[PDB]
Amino acid sequence: QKNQAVNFLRMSARVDAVAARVQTAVTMGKVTKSMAGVVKSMDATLKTMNLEK
Amino acid sequence: MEKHLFNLKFAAKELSRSAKKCDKEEKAEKAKIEKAIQKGNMEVARIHAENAIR
Amino acid sequence: ISALMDKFEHQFETLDVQTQQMEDTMSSTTTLTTPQNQVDMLLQEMADEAGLD
Amino acid sequence: FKAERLRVNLRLVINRLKLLEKKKTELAQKARKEIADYLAAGKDERARIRVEHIIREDYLVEAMEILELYCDLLLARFGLIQSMKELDSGLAESVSTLIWAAPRLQSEVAELKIVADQLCAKYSKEYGKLCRTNQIGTVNDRLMHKLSVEAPPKILVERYLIEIAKNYNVPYEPDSVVMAEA
Amino acid sequence: FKAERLRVNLRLVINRLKLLEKKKTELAQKARKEIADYLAAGKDERARIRVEHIIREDYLVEAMEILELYCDLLLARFGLIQSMKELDSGLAESVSTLIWAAPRLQSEVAELKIVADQLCAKYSKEYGKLCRTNQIGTVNDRLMHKLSVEAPPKILVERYLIEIAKNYNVPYEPDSVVMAEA
Structure with missing residues (x-):
């Protein structure tokens, strides 16, 4: 029982780590998409709003 | 015509409120910096100092 | 499996470079609002008196 | 071509080069912080080429300042430029300097x-086409070198370091072999 | 080929080699911990070959650093390289060193x-095809050996041990028979 406690708990560690980096990957994804969104909408609204007018 | 007046006043009071928040966050962020550097962490202390400034 | 795993390393490695790049442009666009000098004097300000309260 | 386009675009150019100038200064500063990080730990060489990127952005700052100046000058006598079909002695500089600076800075600023x-x-007097290419030797030379892209002499670099x-x-221990020569 | 591709890819290469460098350092460290585990319990020999894997990853670290440098150099004078059809004296090095380093490091980095x-x-001047294969003798030799794959002389290995x-x-009791010779 004790050595199993060690083994499992170790798996918990490493799997948790990958879980963290995947988390970062997803949130990064959201930020990227949304940012693309603002760059575009702002761009097509920068074409008819171009500074001279 | 009133509609635009109301949107302008609204945008003004809007900007004031948001400014107010950023300021409040600033003070809270000073506090948080002190807690941070209390440990001796020179990195967290950095990005906190930075966010305080901005 | 092993192949899938080195593929894994390479993969999230690319995640990290994506991250780094993103944060470079993202922090060089808004950078007018965070001078270096200001941050220096701030961090110093809370350095000397740091634990004095 | 119209007059109002010229005016409005000059004013927008001034604003643009202003913000862009300030920002390039701050960015330069921060990167100087990076230099300070390198020289205290790792190799000198890397730090050196990095400060060559620094010296580049600095030259862009200075350049943008003098060019900004010439823009403002043209904007002040702008009342005059709407009359004569020929550029007079006063504007005989900023015309060439601004025209010639277009293909260099176009990426940073389109309005230019x-x-x-x-x-x-x-x-139609010595501007446009081959004549344009032939009037552009007479610009401000100082601005020309400040702007022109060439690797600086290493003594200057090492000075910045x-x-x-x-x-x-x-x-920091600057090579004594460089200081002797130029 | 385009200019912008060259630029953007150089900047991505610098970032890539940066993270990859840092990470290889940490990994190396941890494996050194493994060495410390071996020498205190089991055979020397196993530990020895293991630290040959160490010396490999170390050479990759160093190599990636100097190559990173040359990349940054090309990126600094990059304003110049967009003009001349012929590489000048200044860039006459990093061109060859970077080109030749492609087939070695391609697995770690594709952007390279x-x-x-x-x-x-x-x-079209002495690059591409057989001419490319013939200009690649002139690269940085130091980088060439740091990178090239050959088993290190056992004195170096035993030093690391x-x-x-x-x-x-x-x-640890290093064989006195090795220290005598080279």
Whole structure:
């Protein structure tokens, strides 16, 4: 029982780590998409709003 | 015509409120910096100092 | 499996470079609002008196 | 070409070069902080080429300042430029300096390009086409070198490394073999 | 080939080699911990070959650093390289060193390969094909040996075993028969 406690708990560690980096990957994804969104909408609204007018 | 007046006043009071928040966050962020550097962490202390400034 | 795993390393490695790049442009666009000098004097300000309260 | 386009675009160019100038200064500063990080830990060489990127952005700052000046000058006597079909002695400089600076800076600023056209087509006297390519030798030479892209002499670079080393207080030992020569 | 591809890819290459460098350092460290585990319990020999894997990853670290440098150099004078159809004296090094380093490092970094092409096809002067294979003798030789794959002389290995033994404080008795010779 004790050595199993060690083994499992170790798996918990490493799997948790990958879980963290995947988390970062997803949130990064959201930020990227949304940012693309603002760059575009702002761009097509920068074409008819171009500074001279 | 009133509609635009109301949107302008609204945008003004809007900007004031948001400014107010950023300021409040600033003070809270000073506090948080002190807690941070209390440990001796020179990195967290950095990005906190930075966010305080901005 | 092993192949899938080195593929894994390479993969999230690319995640990290994506991250780094993103944060470079993202922090060089808004950078007018965070001078270096200001941050220096701030961090110093809370350095000397740091634990004095 | 129209007059109002020229005016409005000049004012937008001034604003643009202003913000862009300030920002390039701050960015330069921060990167200087990076230099200070390198010289205190790792190799000198990497730090050196990095401060070559620094010296580049610095030259862009200075250049943008003098060019900004000439823009403002043209904007002040702008009342005059709407009359004569020939550029007079006073504006005989900023015309060439601004026109010639178009293909260099176009990436940072597009408005500079549009202004460049607006002037380019206002003159059938030695501007446009091959004549344009032949009037552009007479510009401000100082601005020309400040702007022109060539690797600086390493003594200048190593000087910057000295100063940067000093401000953030890191020990630096500049090669004594460089100081002797030029 | 285009210019912007070259630039963007160089900047991505710098970032890539940066993270990859840092990470290889940490990984190396941890494996050194493994060495410390071996020498204190089991055979020396196993530990020895293991630290040959160490010396490999170390050479990759160093190599990636100098190559990173040359990349940054090309990126600094990059304003110049967009003009001349012929590489001048200044860049006459990093061109060859970066081009030649493509087939070695391609697995760790693909962007290095794409850059390698981007330069390769920008020159019809002694680059590409058999001419490419014939200009690649002139690269930085130091980088060439740091990178090239050959088993290190066992004195170097056994030196590393000495140091590693010391840092984690384990008794080690290096063969006195090796120290005599080279």
